[PDB]
Amino acid sequence: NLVPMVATV
Amino acid sequence: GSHSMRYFFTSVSRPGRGEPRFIAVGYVDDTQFVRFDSDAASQRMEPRAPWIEQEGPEYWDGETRKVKAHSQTHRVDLGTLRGYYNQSEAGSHTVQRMYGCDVGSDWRFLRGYHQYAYDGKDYIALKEDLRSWTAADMAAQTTKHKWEAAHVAEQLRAYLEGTCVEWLRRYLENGKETLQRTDAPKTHMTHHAVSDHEATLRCWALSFYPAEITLTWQRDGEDQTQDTELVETRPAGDGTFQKWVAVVVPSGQEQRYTCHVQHEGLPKPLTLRW
């Protein structure tokens, strides 16, 4: 199950 | 024994036209269970292990949604990083991300991780405590400040100690017939003569799972590393792994040398002789 959100650098 | 769930993501920019090539793969231990490839026709997260096929369309919808979002974040990142590093639009560049969780034999949380690299160099990584960041350079320090302000570590920590562990357990249970089975190495020895005074003994380990293994040589019961060659553990292609270790010995003295094999599928480490 993938992480819900992925922050941009 | 211990278990893990890990996701790996690679984006490679395409300077002249269009979005990056994005490839995402998911693993439980050494078993790939899902993939997404931006060049593939489906544009869905795809199953790669039978036990994940148990999950319903809602799972697939959710994972597809999230993995596309991961791809868009990477696309934006490649542009941002080009700016941070004052690079031109001419060259292709790479971002890589890995995250996931480890559990012990009791399936309780041990460790979490989330790391990022640009053009194969460390960029930024979550520290072991899951509360702070390791930024390799001033560009990554600017990222660290942004992620601190936005409490990114807090969100990740909740996932890594929660959902990640919870879904790892789910997969381990659903896929128990293979995921919870250990395949002990099948071992044998080969012999070669290079001259009339020098021989090579090669100790083989085949068809084992998980990939973790130790192969070593002893001479007269003492550790021997000189004149040995140990190859990288390699995938067989059927879900199992292979490795070998070889030693060079005086012809006629083969009897002094013993190969020792350790693996979670062997209750007792194994010894082989020529």
Partner: protein, 100 residues
């Protein structure tokens, strides 16, 4: 720009026996960047039906791929893997050695 040269191993999926269906593998690892050309050769000639694994990478960020094709070993047929990458001035060829 970091550039790492691929390591190459060529080998069969199952213990190799003449007349018995098997797979021939070329495992490439430890390379960066990810763009790589890998061919499997039968008697010096490129094999057409070759598949490969999904791109992934190790702790140190280096990439790895498995390329593989169905084959039935015979006494006479020679097999190899031919790899090109930015780090290689010329293609690298590694022969399959079943006696290893």
């Amino acid at each position: 720009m970091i550039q790492r040269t691929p390591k190459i191993q060529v080998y069969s999926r199952h213990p190799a026996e003449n007349g018995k269906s098997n797979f021939l593998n070329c495992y490439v690892s430890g390379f960066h960047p990810s763009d790589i050309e890998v061919d499997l050769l039968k008697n010096g000639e490129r094999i057409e039906k070759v598949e490969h694994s999904d791109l992934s990478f190790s702790k140190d960020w280096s990439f790895y791929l498995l390329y593989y094709t169905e084959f039935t070993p015979t006494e006479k047929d020679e097999y190899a893997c031919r790899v090109n990458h930015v780090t290689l001035s010329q293609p690298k060829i590694v022969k399959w050695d079943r006696d290893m």
